[PDB]
Swiss-Prot record, chains A, B:
Single GO MF annotation: ureidoglycolate hydrolase activity
Lineage summary: Bacteria, Pseudomonadati, Pseudomonadota, Gammaproteobacteria, Pseudomonadales
The name this protein goes by in its record: Ureidoglycolate lyase
InterPro entries linked: RmlC_Cupin_sf, UAH_cupin, Ureidogly_lyase, Ureidogly_lyase_bac, Ureidoglycolate_lyase_dom_sf
Role noted for this protein: Catalyzes the catabolism of the allantoin degradation intermediate (S)-ureidoglycolate, generating urea and glyoxylate. Involved in the utilization of allantoin as nitrogen source.
Pfam families the record matches: Ureidogly_lyase
Keyword line: Lyase, Purine metabolism
Gene name of this polypeptide: allA
Top enzyme category: lyase
Domain of life: Bacteria
Cofactor: Ni(2+)
Oligomer and partners: Homodimer.
Amino acid sequence: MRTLMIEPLTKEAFAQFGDVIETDGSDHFMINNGSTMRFHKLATVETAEPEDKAIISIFRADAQDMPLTVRMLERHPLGSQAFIPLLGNPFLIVVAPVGDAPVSGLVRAFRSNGRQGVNYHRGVWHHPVLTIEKRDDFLVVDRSGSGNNCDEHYFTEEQMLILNPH
Amino acid sequence: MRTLMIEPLTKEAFAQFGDVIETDGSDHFMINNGSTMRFHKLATVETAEPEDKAIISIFRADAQDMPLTVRMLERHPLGSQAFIPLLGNPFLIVVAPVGDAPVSGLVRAFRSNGRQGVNYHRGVWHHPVLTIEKRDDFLVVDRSGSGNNCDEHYFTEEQMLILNPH
Ligand code: NA
Ligand code: NA
Ligand code: NA
């Protein structure tokens, strides 16, 4: 068992897991006759087949008791999944690199500053949304289609991680 | 010139133009051990070709001078386009039903309560983002691909409309 280090979310640090949806440090160009800044293609929705559809949902999640014992992680082998804060609240993210099974020693914890969303690449292991506030709203963009799009992996007792935010 | 009636945004009134992305009055089911409410598939991203990709961007738009003279509308013939407020600010929406050209007499104006986003269906005529605050941020989900995905139609002088929120 080991305690996760809560790292500030950044494009460079999160690169192996997906994309960071934010305006800070992001490229853009002008549109609407120069009245709007378009921070273009911060993330791309990936699907297994072109027949698949990208859908938009809203998740209203309640906080989990902390410290949290990370007992499992899930992945979507057939599509990406994006979470974007709607209320400006910071939130937590737990992920592990792609692989047949998430490697406990490679698990990472990130903290969004409230103005950052994330898009988990297809196959990336991650924990169900972890809010900091008692209740929070997230805009979610993911894949809709046939087949298996959710693998769950439960760590052994010794492989469990501890998330202790302060 | 006709002065537009600013109507409150609702699913039923906006149905001809697209979907309203909100939790109020929307269906949902529980996930994550009953800790999260999933307001499922509030909108579906539609594309024209299988090679097309759904992308996520952020628009930082400046307010337009009011009263505003509506003299054009745009449409995306190859895909849908969704706008979701990120700062919880209400905003204005101007649309017209599908057709070779936007019909002035059918143009409608809506006002989001700040907790509502909108997804313009493919082919629906709409006006470039109209913020109420001096500056505002929106999460945008739309189609990315080859071809022409933007038709801008300018109204004649007598077809122009007036948007006067004050
Ligand atoms: Na505690
Ligand atoms: Na997931
Ligand atoms: Na399976």
